[PDB]
Amino acid sequence: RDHLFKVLVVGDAAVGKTSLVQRYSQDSFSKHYKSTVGVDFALKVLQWSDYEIVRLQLWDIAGLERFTSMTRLYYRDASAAVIMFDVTNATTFSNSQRWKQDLDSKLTLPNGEPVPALLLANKSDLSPWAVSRDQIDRFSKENGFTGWTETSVKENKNINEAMRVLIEKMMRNS
Ligand SMILES: Nc1nc2c(ncn2[C@@H]2O[C@H](COP(=O)(O)OP(=O)(O)O)[C@@H](O)[C@H]2O)c(=O)[nH]1
Ligand SMILES: [Mg+2]
Numbered sequence: 001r002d003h004l005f006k007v008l009v010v011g012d013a014a015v016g017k018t019s020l021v022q023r024y025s026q027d028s029f030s031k032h033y034k035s036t037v038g039v040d041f042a043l044k045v046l047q048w049s050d051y052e053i054v055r056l057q058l059w060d061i062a063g064l065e066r067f068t069s070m071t072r073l074y075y076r077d078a079s080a081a082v083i084m085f086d087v088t089n090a091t092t093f094s095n096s097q098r099w100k101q102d103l104d105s106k107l108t109l110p111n112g113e114p115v116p117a118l119l120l121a122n123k124s125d126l127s128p129w130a131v132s133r134d135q136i137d138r139f140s141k142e143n144g145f146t147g148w149t150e151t152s153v154k155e156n157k158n159i160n161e162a163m164r165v166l167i168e169k170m171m172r173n174s
Helices: 017-024 062-067 090-106 133-142 159-172
Strands: 002-011 042-049 052-060 080-086 117-122 147-150
Touching (some): 017 042, 017 052, 080 159, 117 133
Parallel strands (some): 002 052
């Protein structure tokens, strides 16, 4: 059995989105697949059990990231969103509210419920931050995120584990 999940990686310019996809996709292991799959997204494939795999399409909002509003070809049929901000740039934090409001205005799961949304406070390795952890938690709750965590794509801190718990949630919602 194959479980296919389209995951949106959204957030303002310069927060670390392309770096997250480059680290977490399979592209540092093999890119042979791109010639027939294309490049709208990057893949990651994981064995899930003896008879099941999980396949993730990682969609980077990329060229339209500064518009803070997703287009239909980008968001359609997604199973989750990773909304990234830079802890050192409060504008990217504030704009995560606009990204989340846009997601919920555009997309639900097939059952009509909201898509899971994981808020990543990225660049946690830098100092000082422009927001506090208590501020992030209140913001995550007030805006209806599934949860939040700090990450450093640069130091590979919390990346794999944050994505892993999101996969497990997408499997539960399947
Ligand atoms: N210090 C630090 N730099 C990061 C981190 N993640 C990304 N960067 C850097 O931030 C810059 C922008 O990253 P990029 O992935 O292009 O951001 P995007 O514009 O959201 O795609 C690059 O120089 C990255 O190396 C992080 O966790 N910590
Ligand atoms: Mg980018």
